[PDB]
């Protein structure tokens, strides 16, 4: 299977209440493994998955050094964005950054990411060719022109194609029993009349990993897209995920409905019926 590593960082300015809060978290696929919080007392990159704890002290020192440098950099970038957008120093603003890589089944590089959002909207993003940028607006174009002239993109390629791929490969082997597992959903159905002529059928997927899943209701073999109530996949809290899909059905007609579950952990997709 293909795999990904991501780091997600958030800087939030809080004028009059000190310096911006910086939080960064690291993920392999759907599993978090590290975090950094500028407000926390330790000022260390800290483990959040058991298989990363076996990294020696040079790892924790170096990763701490890197993430703290990023926190300083994005602090300054908050101030530059403030000037580019002609915004007052009174308000609270947010700079988000994501970076990482995807690898294929064979562990080889597929994609690298290096991208920012300011106040919740695209700012600048490294494009697929790893040579050019997509800027969202006129303020981001200033940065884009600066970074093109300085060849920022080229200077990130060693990390994206090398360090990131290599690290992801190491984590996937060290966390093999966790990260390469595939837990199929445990499924069931619930049925609740809502009047004397209608009833809810709810199809449940529980305990699955990875989070990617598809739950669809059909009636007499036809997809019920517009009438299905479908909640966002949600964490159980133990490292697995949950989802359900409900349809409101005329009573006595429950047998026309089927819920179809596709998950990478199922040899064949499931068809459930009440």
């Amino acid at each position: 299977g293909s795999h990904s590593m991501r780091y997600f960082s958030t800087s939030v300015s809080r004028p009059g209440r000190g310096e911006p809060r910086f939080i960064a978290v690291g993920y392999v696929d759907d599993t978090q493994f590290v975090r950094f919080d500028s407000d926390a007392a330790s000022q260390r990159m800290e483990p959040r998955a058991p298989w990363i704890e076996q990294e020696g002290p040079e790892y924790w020192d170096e990763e701490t050094g890197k993430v703290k440098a990023h926190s300083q950099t994005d602090r300054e970038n908050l101030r530059i964005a403030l000037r580019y957008y002609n915004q007052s120093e009174a308000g609270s603003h947010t700079l988000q950054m994501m970076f990482g890589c995807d690898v294929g089944s064979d562990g080889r590089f597929l994609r690298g990411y290096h991208q920012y959002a300011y106040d919740g909207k695209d700012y600048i993003a490294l494009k697929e060719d790893l040579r050019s940028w997509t800027a969202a607006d006129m303020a981001a174009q200033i940065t884009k022109r600066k970074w093109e002239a300085a060849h920022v993109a080229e200077q990130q390629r060693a990390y994206l194609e090398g360090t990131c791929v290599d690290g992801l490969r190491r984590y996937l082997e060290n966390g093999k029993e966790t990260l390469q597992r595939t837990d199929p959903p445990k499924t069931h159905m619930t049925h609740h009349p809502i009047s004397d002529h209608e009833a809810t059928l709810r199809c449940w997927a529980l305990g699955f990993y990875p989070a990617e899943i598809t739950l669809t209701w059909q009636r007499d073999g036809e997809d019920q897209t517009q009438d299905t109530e479908l909640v966002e996949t949600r964490p159980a809290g133990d490292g697995t995920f949950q989802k359900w899909a409900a349809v409101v059905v005329p009573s006595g007609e429950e047998q026309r409905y089927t819920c179809h579950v596709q998950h990478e952990g199922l040899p064949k997709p499931l068809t459930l019926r009440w």
Partner: peptide, 9 residues
């Protein structure tokens, strides 16, 4: 593995 980030907007 984190990356080094030093570039300014």
């Amino acid at each position: 593995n984190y990356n080094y980030q030093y570039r300014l907007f």
